[PDB]
Amino acid sequence: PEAYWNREQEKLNRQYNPILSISHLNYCEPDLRVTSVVTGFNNLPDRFKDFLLYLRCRNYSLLIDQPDKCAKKPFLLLAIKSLTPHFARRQAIRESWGQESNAQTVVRVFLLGQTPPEDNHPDLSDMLKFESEKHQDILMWNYRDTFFNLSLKEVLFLRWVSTSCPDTEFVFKGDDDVFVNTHHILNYLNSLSKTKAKDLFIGDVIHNAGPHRDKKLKYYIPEVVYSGLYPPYAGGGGFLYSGHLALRLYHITDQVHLYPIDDVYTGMCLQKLGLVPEKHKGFRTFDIEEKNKNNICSYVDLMLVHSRKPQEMIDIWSQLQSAHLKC
Ligand SMILES: *[C@@H]1O[C@H](CO)[C@@H](O[C@@H]2O[C@H](CO)[C@@H](O[C@@H]3O[C@H](CO[C@H]4O[C@H](CO)[C@@H](O)[C@H](O)[C@@H]4O)[C@@H](O)[C@H](O[C@H]4O[C@H](CO)[C@@H](O)[C@H](O)[C@@H]4O)[C@@H]3O)[C@H](O)[C@H]2NC(C)=O)[C@H](O)[C@H]1NC(C)=O
Ligand SMILES: CC(=O)N[C@@H]1[C@@H](O)[C@H](O[C@@H]2O[C@H](CO)[C@H](O)[C@H](O[C@@H]3O[C@H](CO)[C@@H](O)[C@H](O)[C@H]3NC(C)=O)[C@H]2O)[C@@H](CO)O[C@H]1O
Ligand SMILES: O=c1ccn([C@@H]2O[C@H](COP(=O)(O)OP(=O)(O)O)[C@@H](O)[C@H]2O)c(=O)[nH]1
Ligand SMILES: *[C@@H]1O[C@H](CO)[C@@H](O)[C@H](O)[C@H]1NC(C)=O
Ligand SMILES: [Cl-]
Ligand SMILES: [Cl-]
Ligand SMILES: [Mg+2]
């Protein structure tokens, strides 16, 4: 078409689809041709200019790995998107719904990029090494951890699954400011037939959405960048899928250009597999009703709630342990 991403994506489609008859994965120099191709490139916000220049570079390497995380074969892998300074959020997740267990082994990793000093981030590196050496649940890549780079966090994670955790039955991928009912999730996982557990992918799916064009909102996308409607995509606050689908998802990522909104990007990859994400009412990416926020019995049949502060996650998980004695 005329939107840049839509244009470069069709070029990918013809590369991978014979019926339609520089690298797009390993080119890590600034693609300067975008400056004369995208209308009004110099008047775009810096995140767009960085996203367009390095759209074709995704070969980033792990700086902090936990290679023996899935030694014991996990039933559920919890992968949590996080930023370096979120020490309290990560620690509260460890102490509540993200703790490792066996009961069906559950493993936990936090996904991080770099918060480099050249972006005026405070040097928290030696506190992150301290945190890593003590909890051994930090995965960190050497890319600039930013909002528009989150679909990069998705691809680099799916790569780590295929190379360091391909056996895991299921994967939960979510944010570090949500409460997840890990107990209710595992009971849902064992109330599933092998037929459905094959290509399982559930979340707060959004249908027939389009790019926000409000120049001042977070998910704003210019019309020179993307045109049309998003595919169905689960809310990035947290979705649940099987390891089998994770491997299929990773191998299809090369056929989809990175997109600045990472949960939309996952939907584009699901669409390319011929799959539709499955809505589930337990995923409350928009919280619940304030009158029900007091009641611990309101959290028993939920899958996740967004959003929650660290001490809120701990308070709910604490109360949730005695919920079967009073609900
Ligand atoms: C997602 O994450 C990736 C990975 O971290 C980010 O990619 C990096 O993006 C930064 C820009 O923010 C890149 O750094 C920039 O490189 C430009 C080109 O420099 C190369 O080429 C010149 C010749 O043209 C060589 O001299 C040089 O050795 C480099 O090899 C620079 O022009 C940029 O200049 C910036 O800093 C200097 C010094 O302060 C000043 O001139 C400017 O003020 C300017 O700010 C800058 O250095 C970096 O190369 C990318 N890394 C990789 C591995 O690709 C993405 O930006 C990020 N995406 C989003 C959307 O966040
Ligand atoms: C029919 C329709 O138009 N529905 C709209 C929703 O699509 C829209 O949802 C929000 O959209 C954003 C992109 O436009 C984005 O997907 C957002 O999810 C968040 O996305 C970030 C990355 O962009 C991801 O990292 C994060 O995990 C995720 N957060 C949560 C809690 O899921 C999504 O909410 C909505 C705008 O609020 O409006 C609907 O009308
Ligand atoms: O540069 C970033 C910004 C966000 N996040 C994570 O991505 C999730 C979504 O962040 P945010 O809550 O700000 O987006 P929202 O939920 O409001 O859409 C959160 O868990 C953040 O920790 C990240 O990993 N890197
Ligand atoms: C990606 O690969 C290219 C070519 O092999 C290389 O020049 C570049 O440095 C790589 N990027 C990273 C981050 O290693
Ligand atoms: Cl621990
Ligand atoms: Cl907070
Ligand atoms: Mg959030």
Numbering used by the authors: 55 to 75, 90 to 171, 174 to 397
From the paper:
Among the characterized B3GNTs, B3GNT2 is the major poly-N-acetyl-lactosamine synthase, and deletion of its coding gene dramatically reduced the cell surface poly-N-acetyl-lactosamine and led to hypersensitive and hyperresponsive immunocytes.
To obtain a ternary complex structure, we soaked B3GNT2 crystals with both donor and acceptor substrates as well as magnesium ion at the same time. As a result, we were able to obtain the crystal structure of B3GNT2 with both products bound (B3GNT2_tri_UDP). Structural comparison of the product-bound and the substrate-bound B3GNT2 reveals a clear picture of the inverting glycosyltransferase reaction. The GlcNAc ring therefore rotates by 30°, losing interactions with Tyr289 but establishing new hydrogen bond with the backbone nitrogen of Gly306 through its N-acetyl group. The pyrophosphate of UDP is also able to rotate slightly to release the torsion and be further stabilized by Tyr289 and Lys288.
